[PDB]
Amino acid sequence: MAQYDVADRSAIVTGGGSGIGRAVALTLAASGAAVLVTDLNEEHAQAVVAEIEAAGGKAAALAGDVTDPAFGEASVAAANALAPLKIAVNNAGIGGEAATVGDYSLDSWRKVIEVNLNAVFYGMQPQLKAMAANGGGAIVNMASILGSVGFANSSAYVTAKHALLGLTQNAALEYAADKVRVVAVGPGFIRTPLVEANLSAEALAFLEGKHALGRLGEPEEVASLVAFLASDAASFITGSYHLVDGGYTAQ
Amino acid sequence: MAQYDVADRSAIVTGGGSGIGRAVALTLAASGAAVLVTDLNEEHAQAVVAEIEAAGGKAAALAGDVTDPAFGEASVAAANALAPLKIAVNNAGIGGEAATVGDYSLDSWRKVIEVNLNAVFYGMQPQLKAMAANGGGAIVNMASILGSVGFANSSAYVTAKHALLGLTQNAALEYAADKVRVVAVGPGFIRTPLVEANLSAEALAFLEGKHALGRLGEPEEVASLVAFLASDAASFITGSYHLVDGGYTAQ
Amino acid sequence: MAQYDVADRSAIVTGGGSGIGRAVALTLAASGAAVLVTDLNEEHAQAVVAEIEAAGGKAAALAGDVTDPAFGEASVAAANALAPLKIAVNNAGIGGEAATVGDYSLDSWRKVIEVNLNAVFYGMQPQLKAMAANGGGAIVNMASILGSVGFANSSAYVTAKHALLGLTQNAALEYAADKVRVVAVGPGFIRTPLVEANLSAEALAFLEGKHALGRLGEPEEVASLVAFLASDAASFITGSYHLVDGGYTAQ
Amino acid sequence: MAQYDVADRSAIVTGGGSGIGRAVALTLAASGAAVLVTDLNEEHAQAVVAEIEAAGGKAAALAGDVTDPAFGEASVAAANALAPLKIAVNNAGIGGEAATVGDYSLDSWRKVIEVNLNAVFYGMQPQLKAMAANGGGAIVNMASILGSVGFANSSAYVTAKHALLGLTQNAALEYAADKVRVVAVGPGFIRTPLVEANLSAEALAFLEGKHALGRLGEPEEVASLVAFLASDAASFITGSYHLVDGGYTAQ
Ligand SMILES: NC(=O)c1ccc[n+]([C@@H]2O[C@H](COP(=O)([O-])OP(=O)(O)OC[C@H]3O[C@@H](n4cnc5c(N)ncnc54)[C@H](O)[C@@H]3O)[C@@H](O)[C@H]2O)c1
Ligand SMILES: NC(=O)c1ccc[n+]([C@@H]2O[C@H](COP(=O)([O-])OP(=O)(O)OC[C@H]3O[C@@H](n4cnc5c(N)ncnc54)[C@H](O)[C@@H]3O)[C@@H](O)[C@H]2O)c1
Ligand SMILES: NC(=O)c1ccc[n+]([C@@H]2O[C@H](COP(=O)([O-])OP(=O)(O)OC[C@H]3O[C@@H](n4cnc5c(N)ncnc54)[C@H](O)[C@@H]3O)[C@@H](O)[C@H]2O)c1
Ligand SMILES: NC(=O)c1ccc[n+]([C@@H]2O[C@H](COP(=O)([O-])OP(=O)(O)OC[C@H]3O[C@@H](n4cnc5c(N)ncnc54)[C@H](O)[C@@H]3O)[C@@H](O)[C@H]2O)c1
Ligand SMILES: [Zn+2]
Ligand SMILES: [Zn+2]
Ligand SMILES: [Zn+2]
Ligand SMILES: [Zn+2]
Ligand SMILES: [Zn+2]
Ligand SMILES: [Zn+2]
Ligand SMILES: [Zn+2]
Ligand SMILES: [Zn+2]
């Protein structure tokens, strides 16, 4: 019976067509947020809109690329058309190449930084302005455990996720006076359909052993924390990094 | 319309007769937790129980001193009698002497460590064992911003609050396999009745300036995060430190 | 009488022609490292080489832009020609524009990320491989206090400095077996001659008040910590972030 | 050829009769500090003084218990008799019972807190006052990796080491104006004689795999960082926590 104070407003969820973003969109919509599901994949975004509406909520899809700053502007316009924009979850991200720093391709490095960091900044610019103009709101940036610790052969990803904590702190300091809160969420390894499909039984067991709870997280377990932080109940929470990692970083 | 998945279980709230503890007790009870309100002050604990019952919730008072290990045992037994113990909020605490490290009195130092650290540990022993035996639960330790930064003339307090992050990490690692989660909450300065009553209009303005949001927090703004973290929605959150500080530690 | 175990090897210092980089180059060279001073400013780079040689040390200048990956490769080749490359200090950096996240120039953002983050990665690729090939070494990345806290109107800078902590962690994990250590240094505000010329009296006084020591740091006070971490004395120090901040982040 | 700017002053090293404390005493004395080696074990302290004097240095032994506040006062007086007290290394510590938080001995908990936390505070009171009177100095508190992460079945130890980071921050803030710096060092697992004696080959191999460098640290590798932080070269380093952990906390 979990319910969040996220009604009478619109919410952008970037990369909302799949995995954690999908879970976030469904949880926000279930508590009455009018959710704009943005994604590269138009049909995936539309499927989540349809699921939302089969469960009785409000949502719309917008297909595009968050690395285009024009798209973040179009997303803020499309969200505001549904209801006043007071939530943005900058969740779209990619894993990058699996290689050492020394071997890493320049193209892969630049692509991971562009999506996982620069596109969050691009999206935030219109999000911050819209929320400041309409009395306040919450931006939740999807970081990772890998925003605070490393993981061999994923340096670009780790670097970008670290970067998000600083961007989060700065926007929080700058827009607090406008009652725009900005926070970062740090999930541990989450069992998405893609992760499940990629991991060998042995590789899965290895990752499970790195979490004190002895399992990977579920997308719904991240979505709950995101929905709480985006809600009016979290009105004194800003600038901060919130782990949902099953104890990964506690050792 | 915030509701938390904390029903069909008992919750201990230490120091539940005043301030943050009172707000925590009211929030947990309003979502269906059977709350044991524990406090040195019997009449204050009884007053909170009366408020909970008038609002349609279930609670009971138990008066005593958390620095007596026997009292933490008695609290766990009394809570279990209401419903299976699956939440404990170790919130009781004192501000301590205002003095430099060099001037700090030994008894004053020892008293702050005894209440703000050792009593949390004393309570956790029977809490952890009870929750492990009945299939899992959540312990929320009330730390502070001063668990991660300092504040001149409050060294014993700062020291105790830093200590809680380690006790929290360790219990989380040790009882994760039993599905007992242990987390720490770090509020900024909160406008409890005693904070209000202490601060001159000038000293209040000074502290407000140290929070990006330009105000002190409200007890209910801490209680919301505590209730979320103590609930089934927080099932992948353990070992971690969660700031509710209006941006205090982001600069 | 401070002396560092940095002899019989070469050291790259990027941005070594002025400010903190100059102080690092002078300190390393005075303890026997053969220092390759790299800088956009060829006159400054040659001037620091002349200072080093006047004090009886060994150095050479290479003028160029760290944002060109080919220049980092050329820097490693030129350093290896002096003596085996076992130290690299990725110090070159820019402040970026002063603006809110919402107003921030896209080009200024991208330029700050490019110099302060991507160029460190570009340089690290050949540095890591050279040091792994010759039995180990130390890479010191120049971060900031602003790698762990924010500062209003310098979001791009804060973001890039945060990113460096992750890049540092990851390279440390990946090259530990090759005995290549990678660390980050986090200075507070440092009164370089350039800063002393730029800051108004009022701006300087404001910043001094944010440091417990009540002053800005000296470039030599950063250089000493860099020289220590780059030395054989620091053989068990890797992956970590080391503040030299006069107490800035302790509150 | 490493040398530290620690001459023309006295240095207290608590627990200096063995392991890391012994290495710290030897390294400080070799760079000209007059070292007061304090320890429960008078003969062990005397043996370290004998080694120091054989190597050409100045030292004296003082046997006592750091949990007696009168002993820390006596230690400051004895150090000042050699030369002006400007270094204190609060290194004395014990391990504690190996048990879960739920099973933990109240006696063991209180003993670990008393030595590893309260005695550091007890010694710091006269240390801070003496150094303030002498024109400044440095206090290095021996924390651990376990001041920032947990380790199952060592909760009291982990809790005490976390506490030290707060005590360090607060003393740094309060005595910065007197030029007394206060820092914490966080070693990974170190091959002291008692670690090598107590760990099975299998337990040692397990811990080696938790450090990126694939080995435990040596006492001399902690002593170099302590000596640096205690020296005039570290004059802008205060309030901060410095890991010497072979990458342990970077993942
Ligand atoms: N183990 C995990 O899954 C895990 C753990 C911690 C953090 N995260 C973070 O959570 C977020 C979501 O991860 P996920 O596992 O659900 O991934 P996913 O691949 O299942 O979903 C990501 C979605 O983002 C979209 N997307 C990617 N690039 C885009 C772009 N340029 N423009 C618009 N949409 C774009 C994709 O189309 C996809 O639908 C990411 O930021 C990821 O880094 C994931
Ligand atoms: N600004 C703030 O108020 C603030 C900020 C951060 C953290 N905290 C933490 O919040 C917690 C609650 O503080 P508060 O501000 O609500 O204070 P408060 O004084 O309003 O309430 C504290 C309660 O704890 C009880 N208590 C004290 N010692 C006890 C003992 N030995 N045994 C049993 N009960 C005892 C008191 O009787 C009182 O009812 C404390 O741990 C405090 O450190 C407070
Ligand atoms: N307050 C401070 O000064 C302070 C505090 C903390 C961190 N830092 C960091 O220390 C480092 C040095 O700062 P500083 O104050 O000495 O700066 P500075 O501007 O005085 O010197 C920087 C040097 O780097 C060179 N440089 C800049 N971009 C370059 C490029 N693309 N290629 C090659 N050389 C380039 C410049 O020519 C110059 O000689 C930077 O990373 C900065 O972020 C500075
Ligand atoms: N793996 C490690 O060895 C390791 C790692 C991180 C931190 N540390 C810390 O390093 C410090 C030194 O530990 P060590 O490994 O060298 O231990 P050790 O047992 O070799 O030496 C500790 C010394 O402290 C003395 N001592 C203990 N209690 C005392 C008291 N009450 N009064 C006076 N002297 C007392 C002992 O007599 C002994 O000589 C401790 O704080 C420990 O927690 C050790
Ligand atoms: Zn009474
Ligand atoms: Zn009363
Ligand atoms: Zn000057
Ligand atoms: Zn701060
Ligand atoms: Zn004896
Ligand atoms: Zn003996
Ligand atoms: Zn050995
Ligand atoms: Zn870890």
**How many CA within 13 A on the CB side of residue A169?**
28
Give the residues across from B186 on adjacent strands: B243
Q: Measure CB to CB from residue A247 to each of B228, B239, B249 and give the nearest one.
A: B239
- Which H helix or E strand runs over D167? helix D155-175
Question: At a CB cut-off of 8 Å and minimum separation 6, what does C81 contact?
Answer: none
In angstroms, rounded to a whole number, what is the distance separating the alpha carbons of residues B43 and B27?
A: 20
Question: At a CB cut-off of 8 Å and minimum separation 6, what does A236 contact?
Answer: B187, B188, B213, B217, B218, B221, B222, B244, B245, B246
C204: helix, strand or coil: helix
Alpha helices in A134-218 (DSSP H): 155-175, 193-198, 201-209
In angstroms, rounded to a whole number, what is the distance separating the alpha carbons of residues A96 and A108?
A: 6
Phi, psi of A15 (to 5 degrees): 60, 35
Portion 12-51 of B in contact with A at CB < 8 A: 31
Provide the shortest C-alpha distance from residue D68 to chain B (in Å). 11
CA C6: distance to chain centroid? 16
Cβ–Cβ contacts within 10 Å for residue B5, how many? 20
Q: Are strands D180-187 and D137-142 parallel, antiparallel or unpaired?
A: parallel
- Residue C242 and residue D242 in contact, taking contact as beta carbons nearer than 8 Å: yes
Of A185, A79, A169, nearest to B234 (Cα)?
A185
In angstroms, rounded to a whole number, what is the distance separating the alpha carbons of residues A222 and A200?
A: 23
A95: helix, strand or coil: coil
Cβ–Cβ contacts within 10 Å for residue A195, how many? 17
- Residue C102 and residue A128 in contact, taking contact as beta carbons nearer than 8 Å: yes
Q: Are strands B34-39 and B137-142 parallel, antiparallel or unpaired?
A: unpaired
Helix axes D19-30, D42-54, angle to 10 degrees: 30
Question: Any CB–CB contact under 8 A between D166 and chain B?
Answer: yes
B44-54: b (≥16 Cβ within 10 Å) or e: bbbbbbebbee
- Residue B183 and residue B140 in contact, taking contact as beta carbons nearer than 8 Å: yes
Cβ–Cβ contacts within 10 Å for residue B4, how many? 27
Q: How many degrees, rounded to 5, is the angle at CA C29 between CA C23 and CA C35?
A: 90
Question: At a CB cut-off of 8 Å and minimum separation 6, what does C13 contact?
Answer: C21, C24, C25, C28, C35, C36, C37, C38, C89, C91
In angstroms, rounded to a whole number, what is the distance separating the alpha carbons of residues C235 and D173?
A: 30
D243: helix, strand or coil: strand
In angstroms, rounded to a whole number, what is the distance separating the alpha carbons of residues C15 and D20?
A: 37
- Residue D112 and residue D156 in contact, taking contact as beta carbons nearer than 8 Å: yes
Portion 81-110 of C in contact with A at CB < 8 A: 100-102, 104, 106, 109-110
Touching C (3+ Cβ pairs <8 A), the chains are: A, B, D
Backbone dihedral region of B24: left (phi > 0), alpha (psi from -120 to 50 degrees) or beta? alpha
Q: Do C242 and D242 touch (CB under 8 A)?
A: yes
Q: Which two tokens stand for residue A107?
A: 């193209």
End-to-end CA distance of chain D: 33
Give the residues across from A34 on adjacent strands: A10
Q: Which two tokens stand for residue A144?
A: 């990772």
| Ligand 3 centroid – CA A175 distance (Å) | 28
Residue with tokens 């300087």: C204
Alpha helices in chain C (DSSP H): 19-30, 42-54, 69-82, 106-113, 119-133, 155-175, 193-198, 201-208, 219-229
Indicate the Cα dihedral angle D167, D170, D171, D173, nearest 10°.
160
- Residue A173 and residue C150 in contact, taking contact as beta carbons nearer than 8 Å: yes
Resolution as reported, in Å: 1.6
Q: Which amino acid is at A61?
A: A
**How many CA within 13 A on the CB side of residue B101?**
35
- Residue D64 and residue D40 in contact, taking contact as beta carbons nearer than 8 Å: yes
Find the closest chain C residue to A121 by CA distance: C101
Of D92, D107, D94, nearest to D154 (Cα)?
D94
Residue in C157, C175, C241, C248 annotated catalytic: C157
Cα distances from C31 to residues B72, C1, C99, in angstroms, run: 60, 11, 41
Total beta-carbon pairs less than 8 A apart between chain B and chain C: 13
Q: Measure CB to CB from residue A170 to each of C118, C128, C158 and give the nearest one.
A: C158
Question: At a CB cut-off of 8 Å and minimum separation 6, what does B50 contact?
Answer: none
Residue identifier of the C-alpha nearest atom 23 of ligand 4: D15
Residues of D within 8 A of B163 (CB-CB) are 117, 159-160, 162-163, 166
- Ligand 1 binding pocket includes A51 (Cβ within 6 Å): no
Give the residues across from A39 on adjacent strands: A63
D249: helix, strand or coil: helix
Of B240, B10, B13, nearest to B147 (Cα)?
B240
Cβ–Cβ contacts within 10 Å for residue D226, how many? 30
In angstroms, rounded to a whole number, what is the distance separating the alpha carbons of residues D115 and D122?
A: 10
- Ligand 4 binding pocket includes D48 (Cβ within 6 Å): no
Residues of B within 8 A of A228 (CB-CB) are 224-225, 228, 233
- Residue D111 and residue D119 in contact, taking contact as beta carbons nearer than 8 Å: no
In angstroms, rounded to a whole number, what is the distance separating the alpha carbons of residues A172 and C239?
A: 28
- Which H helix or E strand runs over A36? strand A34-39
- Ligand 4 binding pocket includes D195 (Cβ within 6 Å): yes
Residue identifier of the C-alpha nearest atom 42 of ligand 2: B93
Alpha helices in chain A (DSSP H): 19-30, 42-54, 69-82, 106-113, 119-133, 155-175, 193-198, 201-209, 219-229
- Residue B74 and residue B64 in contact, taking contact as beta carbons nearer than 8 Å: yes
Residue B193, exposed/middle/buried by CB under 10 A (0-12, 13-18, 19+)?
exposed
Q: Which atom of ligand 3 is nearest to the CA of C41?
A: 37
Cβ–Cβ contacts within 10 Å for residue C177, how many? 11
Of C214, C205, C249, nearest to D179 (Cα)?
C214
| Ligand 9 centroid – CA D25 distance (Å) | 19
Residues of A within 8 A of C69 (CB-CB) are 106
Instruction: Tell me the ligand closest to D123's alpha carbon.
Output: 4
Cβ–Cβ contacts within 10 Å for residue A206, how many? 10
Cα distances from A157 to residues A150, A163, B190, B197, D106, in angstroms, run: 9, 10, 37, 49, 45
Residue with tokens 């068990």: C236
In angstroms, rounded to a whole number, what is the distance separating the alpha carbons of residues A67 and A76?
A: 15
- Residue D215 and residue D209 in contact, taking contact as beta carbons nearer than 8 Å: no
Find the closest chain A residue to C102 by CA distance: A125
| Ligand 7 centroid – CA C196 distance (Å) | 7
A167: helix, strand or coil: helix
Question: At a CB cut-off of 8 Å and minimum separation 6, what does D102 contact?
Answer: B124, B125, B126, B128, B129, B132, B174, B175
Handedness of CA C155, C158, C160, C162 (dihedral sign): negative
In angstroms, rounded to a whole number, what is the distance separating the alpha carbons of residues D238 and D240?
A: 5
In angstroms, rounded to a whole number, what is the distance separating the alpha carbons of residues C178 and D212?
A: 10
Q: Which two tokens stand for residue C185?
A: 């240094």
Residues of A with active-site annotation: 157
Q: Which two tokens stand for residue D209?
A: 């795999």
What is the maximum span of chain C, computed from C-alpha positions, in angstroms?
51
Q: How many degrees, rounded to 5, is the angle at CA B79 between CA B77 and CA B80?
A: 65
In angstroms, rounded to a whole number, what is the distance separating the alpha carbons of residues B39 and A121?
A: 47
Helix axes A219-229, B219-230, angle to 10 degrees: 170
- Residue C64 and residue C92 in contact, taking contact as beta carbons nearer than 8 Å: no
In angstroms, rounded to a whole number, what is the distance separating the alpha carbons of residues A242 and A220?
A: 16
Q: Which amino acid is at C241?
A: Y
**How many CA within 13 A on the CB side of residue C219?**
19
Residue with tokens 């104006």: D177
Cα distances from B180 to residues A247, B4, B127, B129, D94, in angstroms, run: 11, 18, 10, 9, 29
Q: How many degrees, rounded to 5, is the angle at CA D240 between CA D235 and CA D244?
A: 100
In angstroms, rounded to a whole number, what is the distance separating the alpha carbons of residues C142 and C190?
A: 13
Cβ–Cβ contacts within 10 Å for residue D72, how many? 27
Residues in the ligand 3 pocket, defined by CB under 6 Å: C 14-15, 17-21, 39-41, 44, 65-67, 91-94, 115, 119, 142, 144, 187, 189-190, 192, 194-195
Of D156, A246, D147, nearest to B181 (Cα)?
A246
Q: Which two tokens stand for residue B44?
A: 């204050």
In angstroms, rounded to a whole number, what is the distance separating the alpha carbons of residues B25 and B48?
A: 8
Q: Do D247 and C172 touch (CB under 8 A)?
A: yes
Cα distances from A29 to residues A26, B6, B225, D192, in angstroms, run: 5, 22, 21, 58
- Ligand 2 binding pocket includes B18 (Cβ within 6 Å): yes
- Ligand 1 binding pocket includes A57 (Cβ within 6 Å): no
Helix axes A155-175, A119-133, angle to 10 degrees: 20
Indicate the Cα dihedral angle B105, B106, B111, B116, nearest 10°.
90
Phi, psi of B34 (to 5 degrees): -80, 105
Residue identifier of the C-alpha nearest atom 7 of ligand 3: C144
In angstroms, rounded to a whole number, what is the distance separating the alpha carbons of residues C204 and C223?
A: 21
- Which H helix or E strand runs over C244? strand C241-244
Alpha helices in D176-218 (DSSP H): 193-198, 201-208
What's the order of all strands across the beta sheet hosting B241-244? B59-63, B34-39, B10-14, B85-90, B137-142, B180-187, B241-244
Question: At a CB cut-off of 8 Å and minimum separation 6, what does C164 contact?
Answer: A159, A162, C116, C117, C120, C141, C142, C143, C147, C184
Where do the DSSP E strands lie in chain D?
A: 10-14, 34-39, 59-63, 85-90, 137-142, 180-187, 241-244
Question: Any CB–CB contact under 8 A between A129 and chain B?
Answer: no
Provide the shortest C-alpha distance from residue C95 to chain A (in Å). 15
Residues of D within 8 A of B164 (CB-CB) are 159, 162
Q: Measure CB to CB from residue C247 to each of D173, D188, D246 and give the nearest one.
A: D173
Which DSSP letter does residue A139 get?
E
Of C45, C139, B154, C162, nearest to D169 (Cα)?
B154
Residue with tokens 């906390």: D249
Phi, psi of A217 (to 5 degrees): -80, 160
Q: Are strands B59-63 and B34-39 parallel, antiparallel or unpaired?
A: parallel
Cβ–Cβ contacts within 10 Å for residue C156, how many? 27
Residues of C within 8 A of A139 (CB-CB) are none
Phi, psi of C17 (to 5 degrees): -80, -15
Q: Per-residue DSSP letters for chain B?
A: --B-S--SSEEEEETTTSHHHHHHHHHHHHTT-EEEEEES-HHHHHHHHHHHHHTT--EEEEE--TTSHHHHHHHHHHHHHHS-EEEEEE--------B-TTT--HHHHHHHHIIIIIHHHHHHHHHHHHHHHTT-EEEEEE--GGGTS--TTBHHHHHHHHHHHHHHHHHHHHHGGGTEEEEEEEE--B--HHHHHHS-HHHHHHHHHTSTTSSPBPHHHHHHHHHHHHSGGGTT--S-EEEESTTGGG-
Cβ–Cβ contacts within 10 Å for residue A166, how many? 32
Residues of D within 8 A of C224 (CB-CB) are 228, 233-234
- Ligand 2 binding pocket includes B72 (Cβ within 6 Å): no
Provide the shortest C-alpha distance from residue B51 to chain A (in Å). 21
Q: Which amino acid is at D90?
A: N
Q: Which two tokens stand for residue D34?
A: 């007059």
Phi, psi of C58 (to 5 degrees): -115, 130
Q: How many degrees, rounded to 5, is the angle at CA D175 between CA C245 and CA C143?
A: 5
- Residue A194 and residue A18 in contact, taking contact as beta carbons nearer than 8 Å: yes
| Ligand 11 centroid – CA C180 distance (Å) | 22
Residues of D with active-site annotation: 157
Total beta-carbon pairs less than 8 A apart between chain B and chain D: 148
D42-47: long-range contacts at Cβ-Cβ below 8 A with a sequence spacing of 24 or more? D43/D17, D44/D17, D44/D18, D45/D16, D45/D17, D47/D17
Please report, for chain B, the start and end positions of each structural domain, with discontinuous segments joined by +. 1-251
Of C178, C65, C43, C54, nearest to C119 (Cα)?
C65
